[PDB]
Structures are given as structure tokens and as C-alpha cells.
Amino acid sequence: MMTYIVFILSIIFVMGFVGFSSKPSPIYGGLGLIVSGGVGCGIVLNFGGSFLGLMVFLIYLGGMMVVFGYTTAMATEQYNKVVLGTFITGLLMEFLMVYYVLKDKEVEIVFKFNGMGDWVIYDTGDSGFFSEEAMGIAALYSYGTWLVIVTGWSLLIGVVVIMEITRGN
Amino acid sequence: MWFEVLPGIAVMGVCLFIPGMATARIHRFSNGGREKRVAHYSYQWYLMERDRRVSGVNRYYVSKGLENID
Amino acid sequence: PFFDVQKKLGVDLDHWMTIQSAEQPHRIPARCHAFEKEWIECAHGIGSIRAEKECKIEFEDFRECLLRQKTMKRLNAIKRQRDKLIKEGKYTPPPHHSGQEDLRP
Amino acid sequence: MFMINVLTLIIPILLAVAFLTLVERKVLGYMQFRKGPNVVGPYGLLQPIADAIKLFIKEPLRPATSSISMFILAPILALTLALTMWIPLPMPYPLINMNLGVLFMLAMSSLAVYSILWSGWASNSKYALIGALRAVAQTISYEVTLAIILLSVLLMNGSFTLSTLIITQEQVWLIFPAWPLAMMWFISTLAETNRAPFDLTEGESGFNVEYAAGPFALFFMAEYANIIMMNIFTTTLFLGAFHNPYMPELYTINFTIKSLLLSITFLWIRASYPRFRYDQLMHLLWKNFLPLTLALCMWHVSLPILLSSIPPQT
Amino acid sequence: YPTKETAHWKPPPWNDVDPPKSNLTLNFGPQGVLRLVMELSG
Amino acid sequence: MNLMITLLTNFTLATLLVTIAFWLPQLNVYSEKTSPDPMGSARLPFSMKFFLVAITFLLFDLEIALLLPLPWASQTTNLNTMLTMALLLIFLLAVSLAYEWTQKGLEWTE
Amino acid sequence: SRGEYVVAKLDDLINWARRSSLWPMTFGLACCAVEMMHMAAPRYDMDRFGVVFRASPRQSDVMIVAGTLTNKMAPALRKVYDQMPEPRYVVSMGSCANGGGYYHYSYSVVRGCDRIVPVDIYVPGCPPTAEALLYGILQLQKKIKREKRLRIWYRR
Amino acid sequence: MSLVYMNIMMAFTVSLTGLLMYRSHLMSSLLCLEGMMLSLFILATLMILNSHFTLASMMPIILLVFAACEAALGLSLLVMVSNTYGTDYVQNLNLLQC
Amino acid sequence: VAAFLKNVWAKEPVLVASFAIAGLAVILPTLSPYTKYSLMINRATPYNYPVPLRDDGNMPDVPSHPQDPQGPSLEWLKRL
Numbered sequence A: 001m002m003t004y005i006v007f008i009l010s011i012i013f014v015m016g017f018v019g020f021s022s023k024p025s026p027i028y029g030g031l032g033l034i035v036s037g038g039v040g041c042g043i044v045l046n047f048g049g050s051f052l053g054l055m056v057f058l059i060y061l062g063g064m065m066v067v068f069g070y071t072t073a074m075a076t077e078q079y080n081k082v083v084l085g086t087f088i089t090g091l092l093m094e095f096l097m098v099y100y101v102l103k104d105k106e107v108e109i110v111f112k113f114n115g116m117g118d119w120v121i122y123d124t125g126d127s128g129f130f131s132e133e134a135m136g137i138a139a140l141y142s143y144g145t146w147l148v149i150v151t152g153w154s155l156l157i158g159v160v161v162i163m164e165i166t167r168g169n
Numbered sequence B: 001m002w003f004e005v006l007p008g009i010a011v012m013g014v015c016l017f018i019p020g021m022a023t024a025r026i027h028r029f030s031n032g033g034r035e036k037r038v039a040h041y042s043y044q045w046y047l048m049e050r051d052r053r054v055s056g057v058n059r060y061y062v063s064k065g066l067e068n069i070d
Numbered sequence C: 001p002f003f004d005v006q007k008k009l010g011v012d013l014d015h016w017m018t019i020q021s022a023e024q025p026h027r028i029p030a031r032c033h034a035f036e037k038e039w040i041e042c043a044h045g046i047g048s049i050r051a052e053k054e055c056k057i058e059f060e061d062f063r064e065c066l067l068r069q070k071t072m073k074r075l076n077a078i079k080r081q082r083d084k085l086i087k088e089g090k091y092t093p094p095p096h097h098s099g100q101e102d103l104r105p
Numbered sequence D: 001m002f003m004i005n006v007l008t009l010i011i012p013i014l015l016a017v018a019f020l021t022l023v024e025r026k027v028l029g030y031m032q033f034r035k036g037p038n039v040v041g042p043y044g045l046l047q048p049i050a051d052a053i054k055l056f057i058k059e060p061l062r063p064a065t066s067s068i069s070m071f072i073l074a075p076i077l078a079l080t081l082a083l084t085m086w087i088p089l090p091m092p093y094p095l096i097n098m099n100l101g102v103l104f105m106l107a108m109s110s111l112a113v114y115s116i117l118w119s120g121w122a123s124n125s126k127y128a129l130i131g132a133l134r135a136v137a138q139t140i141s142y143e144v145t146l147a148i149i150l151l152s153v154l155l156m157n158g159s160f161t162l163s164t165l166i167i168t169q170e171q172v173w174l175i176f177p178a179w180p181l182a183m184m185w186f187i188s189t190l191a192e193t194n195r196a197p198f199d200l201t202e203g204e205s206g207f208n209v210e211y212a213a214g215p216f217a218l219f220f221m222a223e224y225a226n227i228i229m230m231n232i233f234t235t236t237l238f239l240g241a242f243h244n245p246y247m248p249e250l251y252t253i254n255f256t257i258k259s260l261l262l263s264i265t266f267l268w269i270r271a272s273y274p275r276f277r278y279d280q281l282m283h284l285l286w287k288n289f290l291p292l293t294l295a296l297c298m299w300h301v302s303l304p305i306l307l308s309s310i311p312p313q314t
Numbered sequence E: 001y002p003t004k005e006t007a008h009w010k011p012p013p014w015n016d017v018d019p020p021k022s023n024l025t026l027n028f029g030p031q032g033v034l035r036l037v038m039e040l041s042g
Numbered sequence F: 001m002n003l004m005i006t007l008l009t010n011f012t013l014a015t016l017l018v019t020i021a022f023w024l025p026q027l028n029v030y031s032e033k034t035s036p037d038p039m040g041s042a043r044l045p046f047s048m049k050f051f052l053v054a055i056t057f058l059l060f061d062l063e064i065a066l067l068l069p070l071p072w073a074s075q076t077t078n079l080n081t082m083l084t085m086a087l088l089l090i091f092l093l094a095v096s097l098a099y100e101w102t103q104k105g106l107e108w109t110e
Numbered sequence G: 001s002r003g004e005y006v007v008a009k010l011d012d013l014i015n016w017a018r019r020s021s022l023w024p025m026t027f028g029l030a031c032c033a034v035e036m037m038h039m040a041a042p043r044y045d046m047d048r049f050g051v052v053f054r055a056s057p058r059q060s061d062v063m064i065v066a067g068t069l070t071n072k073m074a075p076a077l078r079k080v081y082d083q084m085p086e087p088r089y090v091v092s093m094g095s096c097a098n099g100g101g102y103y104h105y106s107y108s109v110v111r112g113c114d115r116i117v118p119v120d121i122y123v124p125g126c127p128p129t130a131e132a133l134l135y136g137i138l139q140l141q142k143k144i145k146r147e148k149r150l151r152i153w154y155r156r
Numbered sequence H: 001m002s003l004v005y006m007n008i009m010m011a012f013t014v015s016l017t018g019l020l021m022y023r024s025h026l027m028s029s030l031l032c033l034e035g036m037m038l039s040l041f042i043l044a045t046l047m048i049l050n051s052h053f054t055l056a057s058m059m060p061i062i063l064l065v066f067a068a069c070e071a072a073l074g075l076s077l078l079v080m081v082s083n084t085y086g087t088d089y090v091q092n093l094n095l096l097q098c
Numbered sequence I: 001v002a003a004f005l006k007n008v009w010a011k012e013p014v015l016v017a018s019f020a021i022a023g024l025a026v027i028l029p030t031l032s033p034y035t036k037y038s039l040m041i042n043r044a045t046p047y048n049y050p051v052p053l054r055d056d057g058n059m060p061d062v063p064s065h066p067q068d069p070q071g072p073s074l075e076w077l078k079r080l
């Protein structure tokens, strides 16, 4: 059961999306996307993506969903059947997926998926005195020159774009 | 006078002294009278799991020296 | 229009992140470095139409390295037959597969 | 045995937050030429106990909430985040020794604005919502200089590991190469915890005025846990103490004295200044701290290269 | 070719500009003692 | 694993204290209260300036996310390129701040 | 009996915690506000009794009506009284809050704040001194000390 | 293939069909769009960490940053819609039928 | 060039300090004699295993043992 733990988190992940995709209200939907971001971060962390998971917290959740909840609280003035039916529909489809891929150890929705716990696909070695993911992100400044240029230019242009379109003149 | 504030500062300072003293004594109790093994990198974890395998008691901290070879 | 500015000017804008077998930081290999190197050295220069039918073996070995579908299918088959024989009682697992063997090194 | 270690972390957190209220009332007393509490206990040592028992049997204020669920979730999130900021703190050994503890703390402190935002929207008062939006905008503004100052300091550390930050400061305090970063860091931590002169939730409504005495006390103790925690983190980060590995209690006494003095420095700053106007601390961030912070970030990138003083990765 | 569905459609404006279809008032009450009525614009 | 235990303990103690703070004074039988704000019933007027400071936070937070691997990137052997791109990213964050200045974006929350 | 002893000790505990942590909301109406400020000033210092200085009205335990209550403000006084969580007490400070005072026969003054809110301590003076107000606050603490909420609850 | 990829693809399709079936709010649409981005982040991350392909570890951060800038732009558009009608309702955005 | 500088140091000392520290961060690594040692220390740090060479017979610069004289040395790092 604990060998399936990432899978279990992924189930909660899918459940969290049926939280906000059914769209109850943008604030409860924001909360559902926050919970989804936390459990997807846990999925990332359990493969060895420590820095990427903390980017999910600091930049996706603590950076961007803060601005989503902030903008949302400045609208939709404070105080359904389609939401509840959509939520139970998505939940029953997800538990039928779980039931099939656990009873058969294999399923095929669009692609063939094994039903074993996802620990089986890992590597059996060590990376020495470094995280490989940390060194691959550190390579953004040594090997990623064009990527840094186009990303920083897009962010500068994005600042210019937001200041042009939010002015009305 | 001003030293009347020192009992509350003393109580709060003891309350801040408790967690580090507690985790140091618990790390020395749980790891054979020594520090907890810091394994930030997979080589350190490899050495630690090798220690757990060569100890024979399924405890990484039980160290085997030159007495374990002939 | 693939205006190949990078080969024209000799610059390297994005070829470095393109494949797993490229120059990596600290010489870290991918898990399918050898399979991808063999598929690329097979399919180099001969074009995609010939590369689909002439380098099928290296590409299938590389895809089966990437997604491990045949390997996990085989592990499914072995574990399922083992669980069936445990249910029938005609098999018993050894001590080294039960955790009673005092591991190697 | 690990659960005992978690309890000996988090129950002394609650006791230190309990008596920090007494220390604040006493120190603010003597700085205001009066005494603090000295009647309720001997030297007022029973004032936090009496106040906790008073607040936990006060009538529930019973608001009409726009959301019941987020009104419940905002104190839970505040207390959970205020307790999880302590677990990577090397004092001298962290509870959870993690490789990226600095970034973990920056992330879990970036998540703390949702309690303010959810409690502001979960109230039906529009003016409480305006105050919540101002408090969130203040906090996310000063998080920018938190992240960039913290990056510029950890360029001398070598990693995001908090325990390595003790090894970094064995020859000298890190306040000596980074006192401008230290002073902008300290004022930015003063503005994170909504602490005076940046307390506009008491400047003339707070975001959590619709809560009863119990839940508002939980917000209050999460705030003081954040205050003690950020002072400990600033102590670890700029005033790193001597550590004998055979005698860990020397480091524990030393960082405890320094963190107490830094928390009393928070108490002594609120006894000294008037508040900022809201645009004035926005001016303080965007037009004063952030240009210096970017300039010193360029300086602390280029400085280990030009002096051959790049710290090790491990 | 106007049909029954597309019969309420009028042609768009000539400059393609549609017509645009307040400020806050606060009561800082008696809660010395002064009542204030604010008209704020941000 | 110890982290998940610690998170569960912190979350459980927080939920327990919130349950006590919401349900220990509910046991009293005090009195029923009829009980019939600076704005009375006027709808919340939108502030463009709070949204602009939140978006400026978001964009500078993305630029910070780019800046975060620098204590690792200083360990490279292509140090001239690394230093050039680090100074270029901090300079582009400074140019973003300067353009946010000069078009009066940092005004009335300066 | 055991239950009477237990509810007596719990009464003593909760009365101790309530009288030792009184939080006031002061209606600074008129000249008595100046003397409440002197009762907060460093000579008398209400904060050493556990009586904080200017708690918010939705967390305060006692409403000190310090000044003249006029007809134009009596619904605001009553609204703040109705917004206070229980147990709430009312200290009437000075002659105009007590009985109308020097403006008793006026067309525009409520003749004592006890026509508007229930009152626990009447503190007389024009103004009463800060020491006299602190006397009234200590008398309010003594009134809280002899409360019998759980003993009456156990006897009902 | 692996079992976690099933759930991350199903999450992307759930956020897709949420983004492809509007109810009333444009903010709920932007949340579904960012759920699509989040599932792309998770899926890219699990592949790149699985494959030990080192240089693409900087790839999901890039996938975050641009798209979050995209999110910022979307929020700004919503606010301009909210500054015309008072609400972000998608049925107000129907003037371009004629 | 001097009255403007005293003017901006009188009006805006935060920004003068900002542009001055940024200018030092830009120009000073190109003028430093120790920028070379940063590169030399980062390439002297052995993250990987020194995979040995097959002795063909003619490699006079490659040692047979770590304690041999030929090979890359780190006397400059111990001395500085």
C-alpha cells in the first residue's frame, strides 16, 4: 500500500482537478487547484525533484495562485446541481479507472498503462555528491544562454504588455 | 526596575533552549551515542545503506572496524 | 520554412538540450544513453523514410528502454504466476526473498 | 522516538509564544516609563495563562461568514504553516535535515498569505476584505526582497542547506560581508509579520476581526510563532554561533540568546516609531529596498568570482 | 441575408466604439468621538 | 517519511486547537442575540492599483524563479558565460523595475 | 459533595482568569477620557493589572463609558454594547455618565448611561480621579471574583 | 507504461474538458487553463526525473515561467472585462456576433 | 558630470548607491586578478571519477600512479 503512495497522491491529484474543473465558484476552485498543486508537488518530490517541487510551492502556489485568489477576491461579490453532478461523474470515472487498473494490473484508455506501483521504473544507482536535477537546473546559466535571453526578454515584454493594456489609453 | 522583565525572558529562553537540546539528545540516543548521519546526497545514502548491510543488525550506526576482518 | 540560422551562422542556440546523449553537466548519462546513441548513429543521414524501416530494432530497444513496457509486462506475468502459486500453495518463497539472508556487502 | 522529538519542538513553540506576550507587555511597559504586568502572577508570570483561559471561554463572536469552510481553514493554515517553518531550523541540528531548507522556508512563508486572503474573503465585511488585500499586497511585496536578499546571502553559503550556514560562519559572522543585506532583510522580516512600523491591520480594520476570541488567539499565536521563527532564522543566517559538535548545547545557548535579543529588538522597534502610511512602505519596498537589493544581488554574484571565494557545493 | 434568428442584430458602430454603459463612500461612525463621511476615489 | 509525520502532527495539532477554539465556548448557554461597517451596502469598488502591484509581484516572482539556481550555477566551469547571464537576468529585472517606475506604475502605492 | 467542590474550584479558576484579564473598551466621550488616559499613564498603569489599553470593541470585556452620553450618540453606545461578547460589564465613569451630571436638565443629554445599557460599577466624580477610576476597576474585579455561575448551574 | 502517467494525463484531460466547457466565470476558465499547465509541469517533471535527462531539468521551470506570465496576461484581460461590465461573465463577451 | 553627481547624491542616495554597486559588479570582475582562480578552482573540483587511460606505450605526460610527478597539480591552491 505504501509502495503505491505516489499513485495514491496522483489519485488525489485527479480528484483535486475534478474539484476545480467542475467550477463550483472561482474561490473554491482556487482552493481545489491549491490542494492539487500541493499533491502534485508531493508526486514531484517523491521522484527526487526537490527544487521543482519547491518551485510548485514558491512560484505556482505562493507566487501565482496568490495572484489568482487576489484578483478573484476583487471580483465575484461575497455572499449547484451541475457542479455536483460533474464532480460525482469525474469521481466515478476515476474510481472505475482505479478499479480496472488494480484488478487487471494493466489498462488501456488511450495508451497501455501498467498497474504495478510506479516504484518499479526507477534507477538502482547513485548520483554521487550532487543532485542531477539541481545540476541540470544550474546548467541554465552555463548551457542555457539562448533560453535565458528569450525568457528574460519575454518577462520584460510581459511587464510592458501589462502596463500597456491595463492603462486604457 | 528593568530586571523585572528578566523572569519572562528567562522562561521564554528556556522554552527556546528545549527543542535543540532535545533533538541533540534524541539524535545521540537513536544513533549510538553519535550524531545523526547526514545523507543529503546519494553517495552518502549509499555509504549509509552499506553500513546498515555490513552491521548485520539492520542498524546503520553500529560500526564494524578492523575486528570484522581477519 | 525551417530557416536553419543555427547551422548557417555556426551558433548553438538549442541543439544542446535536444537529445539525451548530448554533452551533459558533470558527464551525467541518461538511463537510455546507449540506446539513444545507437538509434541516432543508425538513423543518421539516411533520411526519415529509410530510417523508419531500417533502424526499427534500435528504435524499439530505445523505446522499450524509455517506457519499459515489455519489462513491466514480464514483471506482471512473473508476479501474477507467483501469486497464483502462493494461493495454490504449490510454491514457497526462498529466505532471500523473504528478508532473512544478511545482505551482500 | 521521533514523535517525542516533534512534540519537544512544537509544545515549547507554544510556550515561548505564550510568554512572548508577557515579555512584550513588560518591555513595552518599561520603555513607556511604566511597568508591565506584575499583579496576576509573581512578576506577572501568570498573565498569559489567565489571558488564555479568558479567551477560551469568551462568547463566540458568531459571524455570518461568506464561506464556512475557508473561515475554518484560515486558522488551520496559519497554525500549520507557523509550526512547519521550524522543522528545518538548525539549532544546532534540525528536526528535519533537508537539503533545501532555505527554499522550503521561503515557500512555506509564501503560502502564509492565503490565511489572510481566505479570512478576509470569508468575512462578510467589505472593509475587512480591503484590509486583507492591503495586507496580502504588503506581504507579497516584501517577499520579493526576502527571496532576493536570501539568494544573495546563500551565494556565500554554497547550497540551500540551513545546516551548512553554520559551517559558512565559523570564522566570522555573515553580517560582516552582508550588513546591508542584513538590515534590509531585518526590515523585510519586520514587514512580513505585519509588525510595527508596518502594522496597518491596527492602523486607522484587521483581516481577522470576525473571528471569535479563540480563533483570533490562534491567529495571534501563529503570528508570534512567525516572529520568533524569523528572528531565529535571521540569527542563523547572519549571526551564526560557535558550534562544538561534542557539546551542542553551547550552540543552543548562543543562538537562543541572539534570537531573544532579536525578538526584543522587534519589541523595541514597536516602542519607538509611528506607522508608515500604506503607500510609504510601498515606496520603501519598490523604490528603495528593491533597487539596492538588485544591485547587491549583482554584487554578491560577481564578488565570489572576482575574489576566488566561491563556496563549495557540498 | 437576414433571417428570424439574425433579425435583432444591428450594424456595429462607425468608430467601432461602444458606449461605456462611481466612488466609494465610507461611514467612519462613532464606534473625542467624531462621525466622518468619506467619499474616497481609491 | 519523518517529514510527512511532522506535517501530519502539525496539521493535526492545528486542527485540534481550531476545533477547541470553535467548540469549547459553544457549550455555554449565554444568550440568543438579535443583532440587527464603513460602507453600508455599496458594492466593493475595484482598485486597479492593487491588481497592478499583485501582477508586478507575479512577474518579479517569475524573474526570481529564474534567479534561484545561482548558488548552484556558480560552481560551473563556464564562469564567464554564467556571470554574464546572471548579471543579464538581474539587469533585466532592474529594467523591468525601471520601466515600472517611469510609466507611473508605482504610484499611490509607490 | 464532590460536584459542588469541583464547580466551586472551576468558578474560582474562571473568575480569576476573567478578573485578571479584563480588556476595556473606553468610550472617550468627554473630559473623563482624559482621566482614563491618566489611569493608563505610567503613574497608575492599568496594564500591570492585566487591564490592557484600548482593546478593540469585539474582544473587550468591559465598556468604560467615560464622558457625557448625548441623545445623538446613545444608539451608537447601545450598538457597541450589543456587539460585545459576553461576559460584558459596564463601568459608568463620572457624573454625566452616571446621572446626566452638569447637563442633566439638558434637552440633548441622556440622564445617565443606565437608561441605555445595564451598568455594573458607578464611578462618581467630575471627573473622578484616575485613582478613583482604578478603584472602580478593582471593585469590578472584586465583583467578578464573587460570581457563582457554575455553582448556580450545578444547583439548577 | 507507468501508472502515474495515466493519472497525470487524465488530470490534463479533466482540466481540458473543464476549460472546454465554460459555465459563467472567466476566472474559472483561467483556473482550468492553469490546471492544464500544472499537469503539464508534473508530467514533464516525472519523465525528465525518470529518464535522468539532466539538461531538461531546467525545462519545466521554463514551462512554468512563460505560462505564468501567460496567466498574468489572462488575469489582466479578465480585469479589463471586469472593468467594462462589473462581472467576468462570459455571456457579456458577445458583442462580436455583429 | 560633477554638479549632476552631487545633485543626485543629495536627492537620491539610495539610487546612487544602487547604480554604483551595480557598476562595480559589472566592471570589477574584468579587472580582478583572482577571477582566473575561480575558474581554476571550479575545474579542480573532482565530481566525477578520473577514468584512466589505456597505456598504449607512448603517453609521457600521463602518470601511472597518483604520487607520480607528471599530471595536473594543485600547489597553487595549497599556496595561493
Ligand SMILES: CCCCCCCCCCCCCCCCCC(=O)OC[C@H](COP(=O)([O-])OCC[N+](C)(C)C)OC(=O)CCCCCCCCCCCCCCCCC
Pocket: D180, D182, D183, D184, D186, D187, D197, D234, D238, D269, D273, D284, D287, D288, D289, D292, I011, I012, I014, I016, I017, I020, I021
Ligand atoms: C539583522 C540584525 C539587524 C540589522 C540592522 C538593523 C538594525 C536597525 C533598525 C532600526 C529600526 C528601523 C525601523 C524601520 C525603518 C524604516 C525606514 C528606513 O530606514 O527606510 C530605509 C531608508 C529609506 O530612505 P528614505 O525613504 O528616508 O529616503 C528618501 C528617499 N527618497 C528620496 C526616494 C524619497 O534607506 C534605505 O532604503 C537604505 C537601506 C539600507 C542601505 C544600506 C546601504 C549600505 C551601503 C552601500 C554602499 C554605499 C556607498 C556607495 C558605494 C561605495 C562603493 C565603494
Ligand SMILES: CCCCCCCCCCCCCCCCCC(=O)OC[C@H](COP(=O)(O)OCCN)OC(=O)CCCCCCCCCCCCCCCCC
Pocket: B011, B014, B015, D015, D041, D042, D045, D046
Ligand atoms: C519551561 C518552563 C515553563 C514554566 C511555565 C510557568 C511559569 C510560571 C510558574 C509559576 C509561578 C508561581 C505561581 C504561583 C501561583 C499562585 C499561588 C498562590 O499563592 O495561590 C493562592 C491561591 C489561594 O490560596 P489560599 O490558600 O486561599 O490563600 C489564603 C492563605 N491564608 O491558591 C490557588 O490559587 C490554588 C493553587 C494554584 C497554583 C497554581 C500554580 C501555577 C501554575 C503554573 C503552571 C505551569 C507550571 C510549570 C510547567 C513547566 C514545568 C513542569
Ligand SMILES: CCCCCCCCCCCCCCCCCC(=O)OC[C@H](COP(=O)(O)OCCN)OC(=O)CCCCCCCCCCCCCCCCC
Pocket: D018, D039, D040, D046, D048, D049, D050, D052, D053, G006, G009, G010, G012, G013, G016, G145
Ligand atoms: C479536583 C479539584 C480541582 C478541580 C479543577 C480545578 C483545576 C485547577 C485550577 C486551578 C486551581 C484552582 C483555584 C483557582 C484560583 C482560586 C484562588 C484565587 O483566586 O486566589 C486569588 C489569588 C490572587 O489574589 P487576588 O484576588 O488576585 O488579589 C489581587 C492582589 N491584591 O490568585 C493567585 O494567587 C493566582 C491564582 C492562579 C490560578 C491557578 C493558575 C492558573 C491555572 C493553571 C492550570 C490551567 C491552565 C493551564 C495552562 C493554559 C494555557 C496557558
Ligand SMILES: CCCCCCCCCCCCCCCCCC(=O)OC[C@H](COP(=O)(O)OCCN)OC(=O)CCCCCCCCCCCCCCCCC
Pocket: A034, A035, A037, A038, A039, A041, A042, A043, A045, A046, A050, A053, A054, B039, B040, B041, D073, D076, D077, D080, D081, D084, D097, D098, D099, D100, D101, D104, F001, F003, F004, F007, F011
Ligand atoms: C488547505 C489544505 C490544508 C492546508 C494545511 C496543510 C498544508 C500546508 C502546510 C504543509 C505543507 C506541506 C509541504 C510538503 C512538501 C514540502 C517540500 C519538501 O518535501 O521539502 C523537503 C525535502 C526537500 O529537501 P531534500 O533534502 O532535497 O529532500 C530529501 C532528500 N534527502 O523533501 C523531502 O523531505 C521529501 C519527503 C517526502 C515527500 C513529502 C510529500 C508530502 C506530501 C504531499 C504534499 C502535502 C501537502 C498538500 C497540500 C498543500 C497545501 C494545500
Ligand SMILES: CCCCCCCCCCCCCCCCCC(=O)OC[C@H](COP(=O)(O)OCCN)OC(=O)CCCCCCCCCCCCCCCCC
Pocket: D290, D291, D292, D294, D295, F091, F094, F095, F097, F098, F101, I008, I012, I015, I016, I017, I018, I019, I020, I021, I022, I023, I024, I026
Ligand atoms: C551600469 C551598471 C548597471 C546599471 C543598471 C542596474 C542598476 C541596479 C539598481 C536598479 C534600479 C532600478 C530602478 C532605476 C530607476 C531609475 C529612474 C528613476 O528612478 O528616475 C526617477 C528619479 C527621480 O525620482 P522621482 O521620479 O522623483 O521619484 C520620487 C522620489 N524622489 O531620477 C533619479 O533619481 C535619477 C536616477 C539616475 C541617476 C543615477 C546616478 C547614479 C550614479 C552612480 C555612479 C555611476 C555608477 C555606474 C553606472 C552608471 C550610472 C549612470
Ligand SMILES: CCCCCCCCCCC1=C(C)C(=O)C(OC)=C(OC)C1=O
Pocket: D014, D017, D018, D019, D021, D022, D048, D049, D051, D052, D055, D216, D217, D220, D221, F017, G052, G059
Ligand atoms: C494554545 C493556546 C496557547 C495560549 C494562547 C496564546 C498565549 C496567550 C496570548 C494572550 C494574548 C495577549 C497577551 C494579548 O495582548 C492579545 O491582544 C493583542 C491577544 O490577542 C487576542 C492574546 O491572545
Ligand code: SF4
Pocket: G030, G031, G032, G033, G066, G067, G068, G093, G094, G095, G096, G097, G101, G102, G125, G126, G127, G128
Ligand atoms: S463627569 Fe464631568 S469631567 Fe466627567 S465627562 Fe462629565 S462633565 Fe466632563
